[PDB]
Amino acid sequence: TIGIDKINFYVPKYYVDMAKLAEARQVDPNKFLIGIGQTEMAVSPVNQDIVSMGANAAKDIITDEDKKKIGMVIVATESAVDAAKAAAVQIHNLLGIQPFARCFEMKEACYAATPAIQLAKDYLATRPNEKVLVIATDTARYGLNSGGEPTQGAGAVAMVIAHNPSILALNEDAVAYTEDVYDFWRPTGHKYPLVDGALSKDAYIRSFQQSWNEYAKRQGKSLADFASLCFHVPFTKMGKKALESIIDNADETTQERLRSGYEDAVDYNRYVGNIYTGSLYLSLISLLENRDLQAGETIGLFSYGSGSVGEFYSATLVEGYKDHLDQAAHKALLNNRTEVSVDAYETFFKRFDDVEFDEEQDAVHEDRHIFYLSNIENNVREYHRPE
Amino acid sequence: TIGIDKINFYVPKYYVDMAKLAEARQVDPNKFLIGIGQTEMAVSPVNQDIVSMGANAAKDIITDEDKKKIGMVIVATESAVDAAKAAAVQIHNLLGIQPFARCFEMKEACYAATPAIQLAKDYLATRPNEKVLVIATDTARYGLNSGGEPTQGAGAVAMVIAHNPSILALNEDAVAYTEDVYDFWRPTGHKYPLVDGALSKDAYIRSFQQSWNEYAKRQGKSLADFASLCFHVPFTKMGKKALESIIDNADETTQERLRSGYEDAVDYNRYVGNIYTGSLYLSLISLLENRDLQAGETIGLFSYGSGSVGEFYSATLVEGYKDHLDQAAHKALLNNRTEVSVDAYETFFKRFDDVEFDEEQDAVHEDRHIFYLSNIENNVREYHRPE
Numbered sequence: 125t126i127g128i129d130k131i132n133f134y135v136p137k138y139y140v141d142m143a144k145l146a147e148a149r150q151v152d153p154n155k156f157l158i159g160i161g162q163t164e165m166a167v168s169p170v171n172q173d174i175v176s177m178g179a180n181a182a183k184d185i186i187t188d189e190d191k192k193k194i195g196m197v198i199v200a201t202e203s204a205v206d207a208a209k210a211a212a213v214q215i216h217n218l219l220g221i222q223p224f225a226r227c228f229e230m231k232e233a234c235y236a237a238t239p240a241i242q243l244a245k246d247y248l249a250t251r252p253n254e255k256v257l258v259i260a261t262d263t264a265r266y267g268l269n270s271g272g273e274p275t276q277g278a279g280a281v282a283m284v285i286a287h288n289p290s291i292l293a294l295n296e297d298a299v300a301y302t303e304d305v306y307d308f309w310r311p312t313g314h315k316y317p318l319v320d321g322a323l324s325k326d327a328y329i330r331s332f333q334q335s336w337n338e339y340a341k342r343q344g345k346s347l348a349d350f351a352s353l354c355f356h357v358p359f360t361k362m363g364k365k366a367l368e369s370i371i372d373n374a375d376e377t378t379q380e381r382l383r384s385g386y387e388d389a390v391d392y393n394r395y396v397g398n399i400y401t402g403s404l405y406l407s408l409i410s411l412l413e414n415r416d417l418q419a420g421e422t423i424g425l426f427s428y429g430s431g432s433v434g435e436f437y438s439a440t441l442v443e444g445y446k447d448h449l450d451q452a453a454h455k456a457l458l459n460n461r462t463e464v465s466v467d468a469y470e471t472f473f474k475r476f477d478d479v480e481f482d483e484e485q486d487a488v489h490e491d492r493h494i495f496y497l498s499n500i501e502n503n504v505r506e507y508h509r510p511e
Numbered sequence: 512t513i514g515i516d517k518i519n520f521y522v523p524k525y526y527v528d529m530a531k532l533a534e535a536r537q538v539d540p541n542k543f544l545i546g547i548g549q550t551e552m553a554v555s556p557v558n559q560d561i562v563s564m565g566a567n568a569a570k571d572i573i574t575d576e577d578k579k580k581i582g583m584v585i586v587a588t589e590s591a592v593d594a595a596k597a598a599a600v601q602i603h604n605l606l607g608i609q610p611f612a613r614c615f616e617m618k619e620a621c622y623a624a625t626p627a628i629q630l631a632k633d634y635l636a637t638r639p640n641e642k643v644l645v646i647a648t649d650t651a652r653y654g655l656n657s658g659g660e661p662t663q664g665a666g667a668v669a670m671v672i673a674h675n676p677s678i679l680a681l682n683e684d685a686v687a688y689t690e691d692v693y694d695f696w697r698p699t700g701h702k703y704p705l706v707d708g709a710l711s712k713d714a715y716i717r718s719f720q721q722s723w724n725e726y727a728k729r730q731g732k733s734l735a736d737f738a739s740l741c742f743h744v745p746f747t748k749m750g751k752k753a754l755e756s757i758i759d760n761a762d763e764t765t766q767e768r769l770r771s772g773y774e775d776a777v778d779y780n781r782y783v784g785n786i787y788t789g790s791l792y793l794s795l796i797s798l799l800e801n802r803d804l805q806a807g808e809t810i811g812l813f814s815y816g817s818g819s820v821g822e823f824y825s826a827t828l829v830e831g832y833k834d835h836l837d838q839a840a841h842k843a844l845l846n847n848r849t850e851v852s853v854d855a856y857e858t859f860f861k862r863f864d865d866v867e868f869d870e871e872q873d874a875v876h877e878d879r880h881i882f883y884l885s886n887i888e889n890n891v892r893e894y895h896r897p898e
């Protein structure tokens with residue numbers, strides 16, 4: 125068996141209340157709270173870039189034996205800080221992983237972490253003694269008062285792929301679907317994405333339907349075979365709509381089960397926002413910790429990336445996986461964050477666009493036990509490492 | 512076995528003579544002709560972006576039947592035109608490849624095409640009826656009157672990976688070496704890379720030495736076991752220096768063989784320049800066509816990417832591979848190119864920086880049988896397709 129042996133996520137220590145943003149934005153809060161289904165939005169302090177966030181997600185799950193057995197570090201992102209250098213090189217360094225490993229990035233909007241773990245599995249096929257570290261790290265920024273602003277978020281998800289995994293076994297049924305469309309994209313030079321809101325909803329659902337249909341055809345399966353589905357989450361309601369568009373043909377028992385699983389799946393996401401490549405996987409953690417799925421049961425996953433590329437595959441829960449999750453820590457991570465006014469949020473957002481450091485505003489003193497961008501000198505990013 | 516079944520490259524129809532650039536830059540021509548080992552530099556017309564170049568390199572080697580079997584289209588590049596949408600999506604569209612395929616970019620300077628074909632191989636282990644299309648496409652631009660300018664170039668290399676390859680079988684002996692260093696990089700926003708000239712030379716050589724040494728140890732092999740070696744080529748002398756720093760230990764017969772093989776390997780690169788991710792693979796085509804290696808003989812390859820990541824692996828020639836290469840087309844591609852003065856060159860260059868269209872300067876009417884960027888409306892690139 126080969127699959128997700130360890131998994132974890134990290135989000136920045138700040139967040140803005142969606143009800144507060146709605147008011148500040150002069151809109152019905154329920155448009156956010158219910159309409160798109162988001163309650164709290166992660167706010168990025170300058171001392172947290174995709175590298176530090178990435179390192180932070182991975183630090184709590186990487187052991188010494190892991191550092192010795194990891195043969196590849198893959199970073200999925202659409203929030204790259206370098207046009208050439210893979211953020212995976214810095215993370216590999218910060219984490220102290222053994223030198224003889226491949227380090228690179230994969231890019232395709234919100235889709236990239238999927239081909240990373242899937243190809244990681246393929247790589248491990250004949251390497252039972254090796255492991256692979258996949259990191260999804262991104263900052264979803266649309267710009268103040270923009271259409272996509274309410275769906276913004278930032279964070280990272282780290283996954284350790286290996287043989288005889290403790291949590292999930294990746295099955296051999298993945299099928300991808302590519303369709304050239306301009307629902308969302310970010311031409312070089314643009315700080316923020318260009319987006320056709322309505323079309324992005326249609327593109328997502330179509331990609332999901334095509335992928336699922338072909339999957340169902342190739343594997344001779346139906347929704348009833350799944351304990352629960354897990355989707356890429358730009359905002360909780362997006363996946364809800366996509367799910368609804370196909371479960372009508374399913375039985376009432378199946379409809380109730382998948383509808384319930386979905387809620388557990390998007391529990392964490394509601395308090396973070398879109399984290400691009402990591403959204404699906406943050407949702408997977410939420411599902412694994414908020415639901416009591418039994419070992420042996422199968423989960424169906426749909427990965428999406430605007431542009432667009434979609435993919436559906438399954439994974440089976442390993443015996444005793446509950447003993448390898450960190451629900452308490454994750455609950456704490458979200459709860460122990462500090463709320464910031466819409467005003468402060470906008471200040472943070474502006475400073476971030478220019479990487480304007482400020483140990484006081486970012487409250488750098490509090491981050492003694494984590495990785496953070498401490499400074500940029502001579503176009504080189506420097507990082508503080510967990511004391 | 513699994514490996515490179517088909518391989519081809521494309522470079523733009525323009526080039527500037529290096530002796531000329533030397534005069535213009537008020538330097539001794541030999542500094543470029545001999546010093547760095549470059550004779551003709553590829554010049555990018557605006558109507559050729561990484562997408563059109565990529566498609567052009569691939570169009571000649573994929574049959575209608577292949578479009579049905581290709582399961583993944585991976586593009587390696589550090590010259591992306593979108594921070595989110597993978598160029599692999601547009602190419603997949605332009606080539607008419609079947610819809611159920613993964614499309615994405617891999618990024619890590621000039622190293623990226625290597626993990627792409629290597630993981631392409633692992634992916635095919637389970638799918639004997641599928642193929643994988645890997646495309647290295649880049650525009651090495653340092654800036655007029657810059658240190659790196661003499662090593663500039665542009666082009667793309669397409670490789671079809673499949674079972675029972677017609678040209679080269681990729682062996683299972685690859686070993687990568689990562690080391691966080693700032694020899695070359697390009698922070699988001701910078702049109703041109705930042706580079707530590709000298710340091711980049713030491714970084715390249717160190718990565719090759721550390722990669723080879725470990726490879727030799729793990730495989731219990733030595734330079735004498737190789738018919739020839741192939742290296743990433745920023746400029747022909749760079750590989751020469753790297754090879755020389757390691758062959759001293761070898762016997763006279765091995766040194767003579769590998770020195771000759773190297774010259775055949777860099778024959779084409781001398782008239783094109785650095786094409787980043789595609790350099791090593793353009794060199795592989797040069798070696799395959801200019802040398803007369805026999806079936807069963809083994810080639811040693813070193814892939815490098817500033818940042819840095821290095822990898823050494825081997826490949827074994829397949830009987831009859833010569834009949835699967837397009838030496839004529841290639842020889843013609845380089846020779847049938849049109850020359851341009853250092854003046855025309857600099858105008859082309861400045862126009863490229865802002866994608867300033869001009870069907871007269873770019874002589875678009877001559878490109879009826881190829882793909883090319885014909886316009887950009889509403890931030891969306893449009894392309895002309897082979898008549």
Ligand SMILES: CC(C)(COP(=O)([O-])OP(=O)([O-])OC[C@H]1O[C@@H](n2cnc3c(N)ncnc32)[C@H](O)[C@@H]1OP(=O)([O-])[O-])[C@@H](O)C(=O)NCCC(=O)NCCSC(=O)C[C@@](C)(O)CC(=O)[O-]
Nearest residue numbers: 152154155159160233234271272308321324328358429430
């Ligand atoms: C998300 C949109 C489209 C929203 O755009 P919007 O105009 O701000 O909000 P809306 O007008 O479209 O409607 C919001 C929802 O709330 C409801 N509503 C209305 N008023 C109220 C009220 N008072 N109380 C309760 N409910 C209310 C309303 O009915 C609607 O529900 P729906 O009709 O869809 O069922 C926009 O912000 C946007 O473009 N966001 C970003 C795009 C995006 O996330 N796309 C989703 C799929 S594409 C994807 O996931 C890929 C992506 C985005 O990650 C890119 C990548 O891969 O990198």
Ligand SMILES: CC(=O)CC(=O)SCCNC(=O)CCNC(=O)[C@H](O)C(C)(C)COP(=O)(O)OP(=O)(O)OC[C@H]1O[C@@H](n2cnc3c(N)ncnc32)[C@H](O)[C@@H]1OP(=O)(O)O
Nearest residue numbers: 539541542545546547621658659662708711712715745817
């Ligand atoms: C870039 C990537 O893709 C990643 C990599 O491969 S990293 C390794 C390669 N690095 C690069 O390609 C970086 C880009 N290029 C550069 O930084 C620079 O242009 C360069 C380092 C390639 C050359 O720098 P330069 O200062 O312009 O020329 P310089 O270093 O002074 O010398 C050029 C060579 O010609 C020789 N030379 C000088 N004048 C000469 C003349 N008139 N006749 C003949 N030879 C001459 C020099 O001796 C030197 O050779 P050696 O190093 O073997 O002695």
